[PDB]
Amino acid sequence: WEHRRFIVADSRNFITPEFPRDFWMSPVFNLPRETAAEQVVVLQAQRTAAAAALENAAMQAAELPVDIERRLRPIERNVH
Amino acid sequence: QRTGRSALAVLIRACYRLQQQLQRTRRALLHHSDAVLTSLHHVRMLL
Secondary structure, three states, rough: OOOOOOOOOOOOOOOOOOOOOOEEEEOOOOOOOOHEEEHHHHHHHHHHHHHHHHHHHHHHOOHHHHHHHHHHHHHHHHHO | OOOHHHHHHHHHHHHHHHHHHHHHHHHHHHHHHHHHHHHHHHHHHHO
């Protein structure tokens, strides 16, 4: 056995909250069609894309000091 | 005597200066690409 009090769950049990006068004039409920939060996500992704493109370009352009040596040395030994 | 000994002087001057012309290109084209590498490197720094 066991004992407790009880409250009937009737459909008439309602609740009455209080709203502030300036509650609904919030900058969050009222959102424009385009916000800057998304622009942050796009711009960060573009910056990160440019970061990896920089390394790709660096590994591409690292051959510039290399390509010049082997085009001049076999002609230098040819003249000498 | 003066004919054949002076005829080879043009070739001597040509070869002993072509030996330097390519050395200049060795030096001048390597002090310039290093700037490009440093610039790419600095751009990587900015990120």
